Symmetry: D2
Subunit: 400 residues, 4 copies
């Protein structure tokens, strides 16, 4: 309330700190939005974001590690200069675009919203007269969300093993503190047959294009027995070269989605039967190559969920795919809220690139960053909440 040093006043300070930084946070968004870069190629965005934290006053108050494991990844850390285990709070920035249509998923706003929340938390804790509790604010630039999974590469380097809670936000069509993101497995299927002159001796050949079509048929009829939450999508990248030669090679690219890892394994095995059946029927051999990284479904955290919604409702927010944050949510208690930005456009469309760079989206982006920062303050000053967060994280890991 009106008590000197209360949590409410701390939350107000973080909101005011975000407002004071609205101009340079908007410029940060525009710099990434105006120069769209693809997965692992976000060299400009990496330069803009490291420069941002390096320039925050006082200079070098943020400890910035550019090229953190990946060339376009970075890490920035701040903690109160006091010295009396410190709580580690992570905030993630995404910044890879989509081919042809630019930042059609609003990832420029994700970078902004993660940087704004971190600025808000530090600014709130700097205003604390008495020494603030030991806490480290960690910002992780995670490239290549749309392809590859940079968070997973960072997990593989141990970048998340010391975080207690992780925050980030994603723009979409509605405001929700959690949405069901599915597990994903990607696969490329290559069939190898035996070429033959179809005009002369076509019976001496093994038709790899037949294999591709029969695989497509195997999966298609399988859709009737798929769980309604399952998803299967694929294309025929290579279906032959010339009609006068029986195709001896074909290539399919597929991905499978299911709400749990156990269900994804079942769906993947069923699909493998479909691909291998097409080889048996056509006489070809088959190479089934899975993606470098399976993407996990996002583990919800009930305690973190309720705390964020309470903060958002105070801010005026009215509440109601797959991502590599799912892998993070399995190793660190996190929340991945989606927020509306003033547009009816759908993510991954040209019109969303327009909304993502719009002036209108700035208000909604900074508002959700305020909710994130205020929720981080909750975890810091409510040890009971941190316990419930960890208890919910433990029980959810058992259910898998």
């Amino acid at each position: 309330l009106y008590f000197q040093g209360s949590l409410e006043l701390l939350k107000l300070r973080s909101a005011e700190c975000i407002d004071e930084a609205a101009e340079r946070l908007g410029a940060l968004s525009r710099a990434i939005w105006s120069q769209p870069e693809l997965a692992y190629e976000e060299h400009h965005a990496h330069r803009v974001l490291t420069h941002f934290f390096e320039r925050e006053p006082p200079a070098a108050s943020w400890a910035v590690q550019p090229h953190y494991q990946l060339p376009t990844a970075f890490r920035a850390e701040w903690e109160p200069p006091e010295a009396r285990r410190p709580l580690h709070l992570g905030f993630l920035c995404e910044y890879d675009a989509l081919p042809g249509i630019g930042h059609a998923c609003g990832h420029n706003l994700i970078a902004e919203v993660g940087a704004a929340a971190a600025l808000g938390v530090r600014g709130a804790l700097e205003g604390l007269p008495r020494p603030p509790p030991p806490v480290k604010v960690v910002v992780l630039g995670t490239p290549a969300e749309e392809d590859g999974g940079g968070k997973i590469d960072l997990i593989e380097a141990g970048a998340f093993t010391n975080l207690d809670v992780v925050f980030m936000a994603h723009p979409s069509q509605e405001n929700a503190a959690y949405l069901p993101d599915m597990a994903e497995h990607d696969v490329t299927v290559k069939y190898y047959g035996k070429a033959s002159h179809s005009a002369s001796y076509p019976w001496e050949g093994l038709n790899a294009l037949d294999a591709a079509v029969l695989a497509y048929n195997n999966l298609s009829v399988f859709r009737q027995q798929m769980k309604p939450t399952w998803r299967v999508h694929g294309i025929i990248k290579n279906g032959g070269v010339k009609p006068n030669i029986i195709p001896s090679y074909s290539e399919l690219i597929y991905y499978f989605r299911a709400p749990s890892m156990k269900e994804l394994q079942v769906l993947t095995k069923k699909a493998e039967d479909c691909f291998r059946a097409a080889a048996l029927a056509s006489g070809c051999t088959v190479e089934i190559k899975g993606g470098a990284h399976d993407f996990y479904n996002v583990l919800p955290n009930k305690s973190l969920w309720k705390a964020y919604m309470e903060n958002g409702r105070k801010l005026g927010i009215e509440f109601i795919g797959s991502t590599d944050f799912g892998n993070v949510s399995f190793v660190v208690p996190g929340i991945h809220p989606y927020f509306h930005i003033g547009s009816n456009a759908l993510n991954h469309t040209e019109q969303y690139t327009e909304a993502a760079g719009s002036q209108e989206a700035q208000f909604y982006t900074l508002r959700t960053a305020k909710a994130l920062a205020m929720t981080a303050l909750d975890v810091i000053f409510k040890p009971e909440l941190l316990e419930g967060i960890r208890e919910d994280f433990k029980l959810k890991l058992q259910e898998e």
Copy 2:
């Protein structure tokens, strides 16, 4: 020529003996044609044919064994009453019809043409003043040509192991001393899945109807890589019962045809891959049940071929599927000529049943029986021809 006892006069006598028997041979044809019976159910035809040979004068001059191994099969034998290894000459009678459309393959004429040729040979040898060479005229009633393969059942009982040459003729659209009949393998494919209520939990079921459709697709694309002489035809006998229940059972009936046994084995294995692939893709188990008897392609005999054509050309005959005679032709040197009967209709059509029972067909039937009988006389009185027949039979068995 005009020499007392020459082969030409013997051939004339067989033709005159067939003419004298034209009335009762026609009645024999009509008795089978007017009472069509299916495979293994030819009880009337068996009664008519055994009575025919029993009644040939002098009574019991033909040694008749009714119910010879099969209930509707029979064997009739005659030899000159002299006594001085005897040459064994076989003539086959078929008499099973087709369901619904009667004797649409003219099998009533096959019975007639085999009985007429045997009568002609005996009548010719009875006119020989000097004792005739030792020869046994064997008539074999072979039921169930259109389904089952009664010749194969008779082969299994050793009925053909003592024959030196075998004769029969088949009515069709053109006159040919030999036509390419293919090897055949029949199969019934049953898929077993797991039933489930498609309205509630269809993902808990394994769709046996999917298996049937995927098998159909596997074979269909395979047709492009089939040898142009190969044939594949099949139906879906059972494709489900009710739409509200995921089908847990499906049944397909197929047959495969190829010009050689080696090619039939390759085609059958390729098809087995197609059927088993559908099980793998759908998760069902599969039971592939082959027919009781594989049907062999008909082995040609060049020496017997040329001799029959020379006889037919003298008679006015102008020369240009699968059958269990193919299995016979593998174990006994035989010929299976096709002959025109005065109609443009195709075998296995309703209009062929009309031609088969027509008065017009009698002339052509008795004419081809004359050619058969005259060719049997060639083998009897030309040991050089019997040698060439056996030499051609040996060399053809090596080529398989």
Copy 3:
């Protein structure tokens, strides 16, 4: 409360009236359960249910019309003998079983629960000292729910045009005052080709079995672009007779489900394109015959929903396909709650027939009948609720 003639005491009386009738209501359930009858063949169940209402004391106090439009349908009506528009309250009894597995949907309990609720309402209103408000209690026996749609035949005869509210309940695995039942369209697809002897001239034929398989393929790949709430299930009833004859006839039986009538029309047209495409590709002609009756989705009524849940919570009930009640819910404000009966078995399984006839199911059946009867009392004595029910019924009809 404890006020002479309050609504609470009226609701208690209906519950006590149902308890007093527990024995004969159980016998009613067992009589239908032990003698399972299929759609439109429920002659025994019709006899049991008409006798039940005819025998309720005083004799002929229920006005019973046997053979009401359908031979196995009936109508029973009671109203207070006072005379001062009367409110018309309908209760539906179902009683058709499923082939082979008996009453695997618990329809014997539906008949019981509808009769019990009607008895409870009458018994409550008979205890009213002052003349009770004008109300007619209508019981409608609706045969053939699992096939045909007897409610629709009754709608076609105008049987529902004078009802203000309609009640019924359905046993399942969980307690819910409303569940999403989908709209359904049934279709039989017949393809007509041209027969030909596949061994001779298969190119002279038009393969109706190809048409069936190609239709199956057309729909199968279409599943990827179906809305996740859509359902398509079908079988190949006729896929050919003999493999030696190119099939000139094939038959498929399908049904389509969608949450709204507008979506069902879109899905049905898409499927019609798939069926007609198979005719074009194969050269066959196609006859697409829709079912006699399309089944509507069930229209929810919010006011009736909340009132029933409040009654059920007081009774201890803890709350969390397609039916011809959907067509009723479009013309009369109704509720179709599902209730647990003490078993984990799924509807339309053999083990559900066991639960449906179990002694355990009686307690849950009579408890839900109490909730229905108490909700009918709400509508009678709360004109504001009847207004909200009609307002919710109007607004829902606009949304379609």
Copy 4:
């Protein structure tokens, strides 16, 4: 015989003239074989062949038109310098290779064999003491046989309207004066659908890849009802780009072959039904684009056939796809014999390129050129043969 100026001596002179030119004709073959060029890109081969006829002594005795209508086509003409309608005898040179594997159809030998036959005819007629009959020897370089059909472009320019007979020869595995070459129709099929994000709203898209697969299925099952002489081969050139986007475009390339133009039209319409059915089933639109030129089957000429075989048998030759020569054979009486070149390799394989350039192939190439030249001499000095050739050409055009 041994008569001064007989036809036999003229035929000997043509054979000796070909032998004397064996060295430079071999160099002609090697120049084309060592520098393989594709359809319409045979600039080197055009330069070599025009230089060849320009250099034949006396210089400019051959009237040579380079770049005759097509850039790589040419025309060369010689006639006896006497002057007294002249018979026009055409000889065709092909010289386009195949991509990657060079002259795997032996087209370098076709150019050689056409030039050698023309040289042989001129040399024979130059030795005639008395003025020779009026005859024009026309050589036509016809590029782009393997793709496009340069003969058809030349037909369209009227290049064949004044020829009375046309000769050429093609190397293969066996010697035959005529082989059944089929009519061909080529087609590219493009499907246009509606893109949609399969992860979000895949039901808002129309799957053009489905269309491609359904077309493949439509044609595949159609193979069972195809005439055994029909051929259908095609590939999926474009089957989608990324799996996350429902494909809105697909592309198939097919070709169809049948022995007659009437049968090709029937097969093409049946295939068009298959392609259009896939559009209807998937909701896409379809563009069916046929090739620039349909290739005709080769019309046989019996009189020319027998004359060439009689010449070849005297030379030691023992006798036993689709091409644009079929279109020529429809407008000019021609023969297109195939000849063995000393190898077991199949045309359009890497090992045939080895045989085509081999020293061994030269003997067989010059031998068949001798047969061609000797047959041209037959037509010149046998007006009865020219009549029978034209009579056979007329009667064959009626039968189509």
